[PDB]
């Protein structure tokens, strides 16, 4: 997961620097993918990452722990009900949060209560509405939409990169600016064909195959089809894309 | 605007090149080339003669002087082979049943050294917010309807193998995406209400001939359209731009 993480680090986090001795709350660090590049990416800021999972938290001390990183903090919270002063933090990074939500509009008002006026919030979330591919076979198109409808049944969106923009705008912030990080693939680009189509989208699909043939959304037969179809993007003659949002927001003061 | 500067920003060809442009249609995006290029030589072609003189009023209003239209077949040039520095093909190949080969054959008349630049929509690339399920199928009309009449607004994500295909070598292709929000006003008016939005309603009497939508669900769809217009609404489109070397 961590790997995966990296194959977009250039695209999505490289332009994530914050200024020395900047007090930076992630909400939600998870296993800690984005967590161990944000704290890389910016040694001089004092970054204190929270998780409703205990378990996760654990592995996520692991990880800043094998990759020697000695400016992180961690703490389980509720992004809801922060425990945190109010103003107590000059940044707010929020990465693959907002998809796992179903008042993300509350979350980020929440998190702007522990922000002081005059910061900042930086959102990543990727939309699983932007991926196409081509050839566009059928059966891979049904296993993609599986993904889709499986999180919207465990109450998340996936389409939420797309509207980040209002999100930010209903929570109150001010010069906010979104812009999409696309990842457009082709055969001329081997490194992104391996590490992003086969070790990224199809292990990810793969992941809510059981979850469909459950939810009965999908037959065993087409679902095997359709990964080999999603394979063929990843060979010659296929092309893949995707499209993620990056939004910024500043705390009015 | 932002949609000229997006696509064509990047056109810029050196004093004196011999520039053909396949397909000028109307000359909407000779406007812009010659333009750009003030110092090319334009040869600019269309297989029809009306297009051509359309395109004549439009380079004549905006005093251009180095645009010559020639009424001319994709598959069957007049020109000698290996006699343009550049190629420009802009929305032509979506319209085509056999692209390939299209690339194949302008190819020929290009030096050797020389560039193509190709730049194509992707229909399938186009979502929005708020996602209305009538406005869905009403876009899906546009594609279902170009597909039927053997083209491709799909076309776009293919550029790459195309080109490969083609036979061109230092092949590049990025895509140029258009992402619209209440905090971009021009581009709301311009590409939403001004172009999307249109062309959409240009397949309505098509589409309800092919009984593939019916008139309540299409008017919705429009009506669903224009929320993404709107307060809390964003819109996303993405074109794909290319370009092979002889």
């Given at each position: 997961?961590?790997?995966?993480?990296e194959?977009?680090?250039?695209?999505?986090?490289?332009?994530?620097?914050?200024?020395?001795?900047?007090?930076?709350?992630?909400?939600?660090?998870?296993?800690?993918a984005?967590?161990?590049?944000?704290?890389?990416?910016?040694?001089?800021?004092?970054?204190?990452?929270?998780?409703?999972?205990?378990?996760?938290?654990?592995?996520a001390?692991?990880?800043?722990?094998?990759?020697?990183?000695k400016?992180?903090?961690?703490?389980?919270?509720?992004?809801?009900?922060?425990?945190?002063?109010?103003?107590?933090?000059?940044?707010?990074?929020?990465?693959?949060?907002?998809?796992?939500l179903?008042?993300?509009?509350?979350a980020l008002?929440?998190?702007?209560?522990?922000?002081?006026?005059?910061?900042?919030?930086?959102?990543?979330?990727?939309?699983?509405?932007?991926?196409?591919?081509?050839?566009?076979?059928?059966?891979?198109?049904?296993?993609?939409?599986?993904?889709?409808?499986?999180?919207?049944?465990?109450?998340?969106?996936?389409?939420?990169?797309?509207?980040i923009?209002?999100?930010?705008?209903?929570?109150?912030?001010?010069?906010?600016?979104?812009?999409?990080?696309?990842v457009?693939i082709?055969?001329?680009?081997?490194?992104?064909?391996?590490?992003?189509?086969?070790?990224?989208?199809?292990?990810?699909?793969?992941?809510?195959?059981?979850?469909?043939?459950?939810?009965?959304?999908?037959?065993e037969?087409?679902?095997?089809?359709?990964?080999?179809?999603?394979?063929k993007?990843?060979?010659?003659?296929?092309?893949?894309?995707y499209?993620?949002?990056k939004?910024?927001?500043?705390?009015?003061?």
């Amino acid at each position: 997961l961590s790997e995966q993480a990296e194959t977009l680090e250039k695209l999505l986090h490289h332009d994530t620097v914050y200024p020395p001795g900047a007090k930076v709350l992630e909400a939600g660090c998870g296993i800690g993918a984005q967590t161990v590049i944000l704290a890389k990416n910016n040694p001089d800021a004092e970054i204190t990452s929270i998780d409703i999972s205990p378990e996760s938290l654990e592995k996520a001390r692991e990880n800043t722990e094998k990759n020697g990183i000695k400016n992180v903090k961690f703490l389980q919270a509720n992004i809801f009900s922060l425990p945190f002063e109010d103003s107590s933090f000059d940044h707010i990074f929020v990465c693959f949060v907002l998809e796992h939500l179903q008042s993300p509009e509350e979350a980020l008002k929440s998190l702007k209560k522990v922000l002081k006026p005059g910061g900042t919030i930086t959102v990543i979330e990727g939309d699983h509405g932007s991926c196409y591919f081509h050839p566009e076979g059928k059966k891979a198109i049904e296993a993609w939409n599986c993904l889709i409808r499986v999180q919207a049944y465990m109450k998340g969106n996936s389409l939420v990169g797309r509207q980040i923009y209002p999100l930010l705008q209903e929570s109150g912030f001010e010069k906010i600016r979104v812009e999409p990080r696309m990842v457009y693939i082709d055969s001329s680009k081997p490194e992104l064909v391996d590490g992003f189509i086969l070790k990224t989208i199809i292990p990810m699909v793969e992941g809510v195959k059981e979850q469909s043939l459950k939810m009965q959304i999908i037959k065993e037969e087409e679902w095997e089809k359709g990964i080999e179809e999603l394979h063929k993007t990843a060979e010659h003659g296929g092309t893949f894309c995707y499209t993620f949002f990056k939004g910024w927001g500043t705390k009015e003061g």
